Design a protein around this nucleic acid. Sequence first.
RNA 1: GCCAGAACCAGCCCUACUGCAUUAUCCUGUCGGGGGUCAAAAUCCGGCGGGCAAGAAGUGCAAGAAGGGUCUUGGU
RNA 2: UUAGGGAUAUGUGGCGUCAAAACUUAUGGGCUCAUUCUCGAUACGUAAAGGGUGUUGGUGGAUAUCCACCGGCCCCGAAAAUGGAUGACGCUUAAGCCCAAUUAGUGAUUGCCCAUUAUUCCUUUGGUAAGGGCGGAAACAAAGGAGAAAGUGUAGCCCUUCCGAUGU
RNA 3: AUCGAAUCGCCACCUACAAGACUGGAGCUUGCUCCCUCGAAGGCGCCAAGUAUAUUCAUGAUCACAAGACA
Lengths: 149, 221, 137, 125
Amino acid sequence: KSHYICAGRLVRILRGPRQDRVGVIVDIVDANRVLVENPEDAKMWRHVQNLKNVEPLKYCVSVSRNCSAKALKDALASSKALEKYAKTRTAARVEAKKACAASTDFERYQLRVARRSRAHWARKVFDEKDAKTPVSWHKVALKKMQKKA
Amino acid sequence: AFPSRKDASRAQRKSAKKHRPEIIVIDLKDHVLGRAAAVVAKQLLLGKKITVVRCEQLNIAGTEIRNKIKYLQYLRKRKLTNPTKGPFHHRAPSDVFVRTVRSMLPRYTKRGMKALNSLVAYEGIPPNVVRTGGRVVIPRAQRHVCYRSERPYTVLGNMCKHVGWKYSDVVANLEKARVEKASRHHEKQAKLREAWKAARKEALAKMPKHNVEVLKKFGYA
Amino acid sequence: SRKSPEYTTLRKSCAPGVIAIILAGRFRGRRAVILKQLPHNGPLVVSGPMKYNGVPIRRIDSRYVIATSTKVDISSVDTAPITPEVFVSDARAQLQKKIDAALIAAIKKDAQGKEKAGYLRSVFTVKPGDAPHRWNW
Amino acid sequence: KTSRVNRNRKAPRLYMKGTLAGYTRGLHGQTKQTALVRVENVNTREDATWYVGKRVCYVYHGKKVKRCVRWSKAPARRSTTRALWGRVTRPHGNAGMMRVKFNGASVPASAIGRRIRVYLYPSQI
RNA sequence: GCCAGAACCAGCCCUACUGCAUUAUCCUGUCGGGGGUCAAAAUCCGGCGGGCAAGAAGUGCAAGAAGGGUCUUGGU
RNA sequence: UUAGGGAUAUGUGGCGUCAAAACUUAUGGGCUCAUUCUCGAUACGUAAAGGGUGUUGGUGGAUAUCCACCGGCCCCGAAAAUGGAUGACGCUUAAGCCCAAUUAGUGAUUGCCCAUUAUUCCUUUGGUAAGGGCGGAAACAAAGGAGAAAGUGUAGCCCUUCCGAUGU
RNA sequence: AUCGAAUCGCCACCUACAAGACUGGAGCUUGCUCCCUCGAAGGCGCCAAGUAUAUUCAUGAUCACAAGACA
Ligand SMILES: NC[C@@H]1O[C@H](O[C@H]2[C@@H](O)[C@H](O[C@@H]3[C@@H](O)[C@H](N)C[C@H](N)[C@H]3O[C@H]3O[C@H](CO)[C@@H](O)[C@H](O)[C@H]3N)O[C@@H]2CO)[C@H](N)[C@@H](O)[C@@H]1O
Ligand SMILES: [Mg+2]
Ligand SMILES: [Mg+2]
């Protein structure tokens, strides 16, 4: 279910000069702009974001409208909203591109030998479970063959 | 066009593997008629081979009565001296889309005729197109991002059945029979789709752990 | 100083020890290690080593090489002048193996040095969906 | 009998696939002096500045086997295949197209819409 | 006296790296009078106490002696 | 505003396809729905009076509701003789109208596309053209080379420099 | 059988289907709280059949259509 724009609602910036940074709505200007501040991040000082560039998250600190910029740092510390976000899967996809957009050619090789490992293991586990149950196409056709040939 | 015996003996003298060219297949369900036609008219002219599918599901903005009158104003045009030499008024949704692409091409040169014969434009999904790869989509033309949802729209298969196009019900029984068939195929292999993903979660901890915290740095766990 | 043989104008990324990508020539897409640069602003000289990817001691220039961040820190023998490469001879077959085995000696004493020996056997190709203009190397 | 994938251990490609879009032109007609190449996955003007200076090839064939390079040294590359060469000179627009010029001539107009390979050499990194 | 590639000079064309001034109808501090609220923080107005909002401003001027072009010139 | 050619940058006009450019840009704001010559849309350039409880703003009165006015877009007013035209397709989270930006409350410059224009680099040609050199400096065989004319005009005496160039 | 050619991503995991005023599941204070599958990846492929002291590669000599091309 969609998450409403309210004072305290954590938004992630979509495609500004920030592109991935989370921020807390501290005031709503009108039908298309809010004030966004995250004291934990350096680039996230109290600025004005258009609501076409925000993405509301499921987390919402209990803070009031037009906060005092020091009770905001108190509000997201007691709520632990930044740490609950930091273990979601969508936040892991944000920090994963930051490795891909900073990877050297050697650690792109390490990702390729990691994926070819897991792929080699998942296809030999799939081998030694398809001998027991005839699931795959090689094993359905041979099971419906040896029973009458 | 079936291949002739000169084109069949050379595929036996030379042992020709079965070849398929690089063909991009667009699923045009819920697309803007002229925004999809302009994306296609540029890609065909950049040398893309494009099969277009499900043309009875294209949308045109406005009331169905509005877009049906604009076709009937188009059908009002004919060469009065000899209408066999006139504008030819195609009623199929698959042929409305070929025209709308063609009117965005340089139609009267050879480069714009090599690009309009690169487009195929079926309606429904025919049996040769079904199992040839995942269909693609044009996300800048998809009616849920391009039309304001309070405004009416017009399905092209419904505008065209009331101006001609006597094969509306044939397409509706060929696509009812497909989605019944393709959903029987998809309840099948659900113990093959779950077989791999319970083997790709089991491949972890059967693989060395120094290749897993590099597989968790890039988020591929 | 420009007429001196130690005058180079070569990039700071194409240092000795820097693992390269060949991009052209016979052994394109392979990963060879940059040994040194020939005098009078000469071309680079890369060995593979041949034990790993099949690239011998050969001349290549800087503009046909992507130099990456990964070094192996060679301090090996440099007795490859501008004249073993002049008009396999048993000299070049001996000069190969004497520098070949000095590479694997220096590959393995590197930290994460077995990961780099496998890195020299892989092949760089351009996949149908990847962007080499947005990559760090 | 087991699940063995296909692996693509062919010869590598060290080029980027592009398309000859056409030429520089206005409303008034073409300037065949310089050509326009849309390269795949290059879509921003910053992404075309990386490729400025790279070498560019249009591979085609003729009808007869005319004389290529290494005709005497390597008689296995003797082919009906020809090639025209060029350089990316500058970006063209915001959308990541390049403005290339071929060596000493222009690209044939038959090449419009056909495959052009742009390379990674001359290297800068 | 043919075709390519790189190198290095010079010239010319690109783009990186920024300083000097200016803030005040402004910043901050508390007591009011005002607001709304479950209570109250804010918007708002006013006292005199301090001030530097400091890659701080999209405000005035900028002189910061390169990395890339040159099948965009000549040369070795 | 125009010698024969390149490179860069513009102008008028543009950037959904035709058709180069916003691979349909913004991390800008509003307004607009129109059902048989089919809303609208590049000036010059070839429908009015009047009307609307369509929508969107304003102004002045009165007791959450009424009253008088004024504006924007849209509709009505609006009927012709080959089939027909915002140039065509189309567009309606505009690709329309009015404002505004330039990669976006991030930290200051110029988003980019097109000329017989501009700047600059070559070559030609002509000047109310402007300067220099022209007393062979020495020296040099074959088995470093040739030229050097006191000149309107040449295959121009030879160099350097500057400006102009279309036309019945 | 002329024929040398241009093309360079494979899959019996995509190759089913709707939806965007929603589309993981529920609560009731209907905009917030709560649950795990955490709601932003179709898998592979990119040179040992798989991350481990394993064994060919030159002389095709410094770019040239990749001189390869059954994945
Ligand atoms: N149009 C007639 C044809 O012209 C042909 O030549 C045509 C082209 O092939 C030719 O292009 C050549 C090209 O072959 C070769 N690869 C390089 C050469 N530099 C090009 O020539 C071009 O550049 C130079 C610049 O001064 C000029 O000599 C030439 O006029 C110009 N066309 O120039 C002509 C383009 O109009 C052949 N002579 C012949 O097929 C026939 O005569
Ligand atoms: Mg005039
Ligand atoms: Mg006359």
